[PDB]
Design a protein around this ligand. Structure first.
Ligand SMILES: *[C@@H]1O[C@H](CO[C@@H]2O[C@@H](C)[C@@H](O)[C@@H](O)[C@@H]2O)[C@@H](O[C@@H]2O[C@H](CO)[C@@H](O)[C@H](O)[C@H]2NC(C)=O)[C@H](O)[C@H]1NC(C)=O
Ligand SMILES: *[C@@H]1O[C@H](CO[C@@H]2O[C@@H](C)[C@@H](O)[C@@H](O)[C@@H]2O)[C@@H](O[C@@H]2O[C@H](CO)[C@@H](O)[C@H](O)[C@H]2NC(C)=O)[C@H](O)[C@H]1NC(C)=O
Ligand SMILES: COc1cccc(CN(CCCc2ccccc2F)C2CCC2)c1OCc1ccccc1
Ligand SMILES: *[C@@H]1O[C@H](CO[C@@H]2O[C@@H](C)[C@@H](O)[C@@H](O)[C@@H]2O)[C@@H](O)[C@H](O)[C@H]1NC(C)=O
Ligand SMILES: *[C@@H]1O[C@H](CO[C@@H]2O[C@@H](C)[C@@H](O)[C@@H](O)[C@@H]2O)[C@@H](O)[C@H](O)[C@H]1NC(C)=O
Ligand SMILES: CC(=O)N[C@H]1[C@H]([C@H](O)[C@H](O)CO)O[C@@](O)(C(=O)O)C[C@@H]1O
Ligand SMILES: *[C@@H]1O[C@H](CO)[C@@H](O)[C@H](O)[C@H]1NC(C)=O
Ligand SMILES: *[C@@H]1O[C@H](CO)[C@@H](O)[C@H](O)[C@H]1NC(C)=O
Length: 527
């Protein structure tokens, strides 16, 4: 039996048999007052001490959220749906500590993505037992509130100040600071890592002064705050807060009387109306996301980044080869996971209207023009691949490259990767390629389990990625120093060197998607 005394009381874990060893898992430790009742929409409140032994032996409730419903019974979509009951009582975290209990272990804190509307730490691909077993790090992940319940914004109003889900994360990082030494972990050596909105959350913790002393280093997988979906304007946030209020009959003049009204609505009512607070949505709609609240985020983050206002430390950033393809079957015409999705010029143009709804005819033409200079006009995948690249380059790749360029210009080591391996078990079809979110299982070492239908080649890539991630967390340097590996050069804004991750040859290349990103990062913001 392993009992750990934390600052709020004792917690009991379990023993896990991993790779002929043992990992101690503490699943579902609370880290805040359940944000229920008058606490809904408010910042997370301090948890009151308990005197019992808190049994932390199962994942806790996931936070209320809308479920991906487009492919019932399809593991490709349903692996991302919550695998514990939804509840507003969901401010819990998990700890995986090596066995034997470490002395001063570097800590890895995972922050899941999910477009700031969905996600949960209990997902199978976020299982930290492998990292704990194989690299003797401690892995922490936390649930944080999502959708309006986590990011409804009434700027200045403590009743709905905005960024609650980010403050959830922050309280969790605080919990690691105050308590992770008791589990054998080193609070002076904490690496946040996160994917998609998780990565955008990580990048915002780099900007938020209240976070600067709660972690050491940062890893950003397929996401950053400067991505177009990542920050809700203080303008849009009001229109959306109001539209939600109208949709639920909660419109008041006294803005607080609106919040108190929205507090008597049942979670399902708020979830049903979240989709309609925007008039024109897209598969990447983040209806309720981070805002410039003046608290967690003191100014608009493009300005903070541009003017060097962030935690000076090492960052590891990267993206996948086909980030965009996943979103094409959530709305784009002529697309389907169940055929090869050969689309016409006309289907591609209509696809731009789906993904850039409030964008001028000229802007849509400008996207078409830049992405339809075919190396072969008679290639029938041209338009299908072009739309995938359009969504991936605008929504993930080019913002992440720009974030890395800007961050590195203040003299910190940056490392950029380009993950181009299609999981051999990937349930989506091949035309979808190296999809958004499918590096995560390699980062977490799932292919290390040989009974899991991965190739030996995939086991080797995971083992190397895991080492590279762990050396980054422990030492700020994402090298594999023993098995004659390709050295991962720092990302400088001049040469812009990045490392390709794949089962074949790991190579050093320069200036990812250069032509494409100039369009998105310089031209397109003007339209
Ligand atoms: C700001 O919000 C208004 C209102 O949104 C409408 O009402 C909500 C409850 C919800 O059901 C939305 O889907 C509605 O659209 C937006 O005004 C609407 O705009 C659309 C087309 O742009 C139009 O068809 C509706 O009739 C309009 N409704 C009203 C009441 O004006 C407005 O577009 C939003 N602003 C921005 C910049 O998106
Ligand atoms: C690829 O499939 C899409 C999706 O349509 C559905 O999935 C197919 C596998 C099949 O079961 C269809 O019967 C389904 O409707 C096809 O898109 C549809 O195409 C028809 C005719 O062109 C059109 O009337 C519908 O509006 C389209 N629906 C959507 C959502 O796009 C597409 O034609 C298929 N393409 C190829 C190359 O196979
Ligand atoms: C930038 O991010 C997102 C922003 C907004 C909304 C979503 C979720 N989107 C479905 C996800 C499609 C998808 C992507 C990658 C892998 C598998 C997938 F099915 C909405 C449209 C209807 C539901 C965003 O994606 C969040 C996410 C991150 C990782 C893994 C899955 C989803
Ligand atoms: C907490 O757990 C205590 C210990 O029992 C443990 O849990 C069960 C499910 C088995 O896994 C067993 O082998 C473990 O030793 C319980 O005795 C206690 O009642 C529990 N307390 C609460 C509040 O749930
Ligand atoms: C644990 O180690 C502390 C020093 O931490 C070191 O510096 C940071 C930047 C990390 O990268 C980490 O890997 C290093 O070990 C000591 O100050 C502390 O006293 C030590 N305590 C115990 C109990 O080992
Ligand atoms: C959402 C929620 O509150 N779930 C609770 C579950 C289920 O309600 C029951 O298994 C019946 O479904 O029961 C517990 O007692 C348990 O089994 O540990 C506590 C847990 O929090
Ligand atoms: C709104 O109502 C609350 C109810 O307690 C009150 O405290 C607050 O002062 C009111 N503000 C305005 C501007 O009416
Ligand atoms: C390096 O090679 C050894 C065998 O010589 C293997 O056991 C180990 O897992 C490899 N490590 C990495 C990080 O690939």
């Amino acid at each position: 039996d392993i009992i750990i005394a934390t600052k709020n009381g004792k917690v009991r874990g379990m023993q896990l048999t991993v790779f002929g060893g043992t990992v101690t898992a503490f699943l579902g430790i609370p880290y805040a007052q359940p944000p229920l009742g008058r606490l809904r929409f408010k910042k997370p409140q301090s948890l009151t001490k308990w005197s019992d032994i808190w049994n932390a032996t199962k994942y806790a409730n996931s936070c209320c959220q809308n479920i991906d419903q487009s492919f019932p019974g399809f593991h490709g979509s349903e692996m991302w749906n919550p695998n514990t009951d939804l509840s507003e009582d969901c401010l819990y975290l998990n700890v995986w500590i090596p066995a034997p209990k470490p002395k001063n272990a570097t800590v890895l804190i995972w922050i899941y993505g999910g477009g700031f509307q969905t996600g949960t730490s209990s997902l199978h691909v976020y299982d930290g037992k492998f990292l704990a077993r194989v690299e003797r790090v401690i892995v922490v992940s936390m649930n944080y509130r999502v959708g309006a319940l986590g990011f409804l914004a009434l700027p200045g109003n403590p009743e709905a100040p905005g960024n609650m889900g980010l403050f959830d994360q922050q309280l969790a990082l605080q919990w690691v600071q105050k308590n992770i030494a008791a589990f054998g972990g080193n609070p002076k050596s904490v690496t946040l890592f996160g994917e998609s909105a998780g990565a955008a959350s990580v990048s915002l913790h780099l900007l938020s002064p209240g976070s600067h002393s709660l972690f050491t280093r940062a890893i950003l997988q397929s996401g950053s705050f400067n991505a177009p979906w990542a920050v809700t304007s203080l303008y849009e946030a009001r229109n959306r807060t109001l539209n939600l209020a109208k949709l639920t009959g909660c419109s008041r003049e006294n803005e607080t009387e609106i919040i108190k009204c929205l507090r008597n609505k049942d979670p399902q009512e708020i979830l049903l109306n979240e989709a309609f607070v925007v008039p024109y949505g897209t598969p990447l709609s983040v209806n309720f996301g981070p805002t410039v609240d003046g608290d967690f985020l003191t100014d608009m983050p493009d300005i903070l980044l541009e003017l060097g206002q962030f935690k000076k430390t090492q960052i590891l950033v990267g993206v996948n080869k086909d980030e965009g393809t996943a979103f094409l079957v959530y709305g784009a015409p002529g697309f389907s996971k169940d055929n090869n999705s050969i689309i016409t010029r006309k289907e591609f143009q209509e696809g731009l209207k789906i993904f850039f709804p409030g964008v001028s005819e000229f802007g849509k033409e400008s996207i078409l023009f830049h992405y339809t200079d075919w190396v072969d006009d008679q290639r029938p995948e041209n338009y299908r691949e072009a739309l995938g690249d359009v969504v991936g380059d605008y929504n993930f790749i080019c913002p992440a490259l720009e974030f890395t360029k800007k961050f590195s210009e203040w003299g910190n080591n940056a490392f950029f990767y380009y993950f181009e391996h299609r999981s051999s078990k990937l349930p989506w079809p091949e035309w979808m390629g190296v999809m958004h979110g499918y590096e995560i299982e390699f980062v977490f070492g799932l292919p290390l389990e040989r009974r899991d239908q991965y190739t030996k080649a995939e086991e080797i890539l995971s083992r190397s990625i895991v080492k590279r991630w762990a050396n980054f967390a422990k030492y700020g340097n994402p090298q594999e120093t023993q098995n004659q590996s390709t050295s991962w050069p720092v990302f400088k804004s001049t040469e812009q060197k990045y490392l390709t991750l794949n089962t074949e040859s790991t190579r050093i290349m320069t200036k990812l998607r250069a032509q494409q990103c100039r369009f998105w990062t310089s031209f397109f913001p003007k339209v």
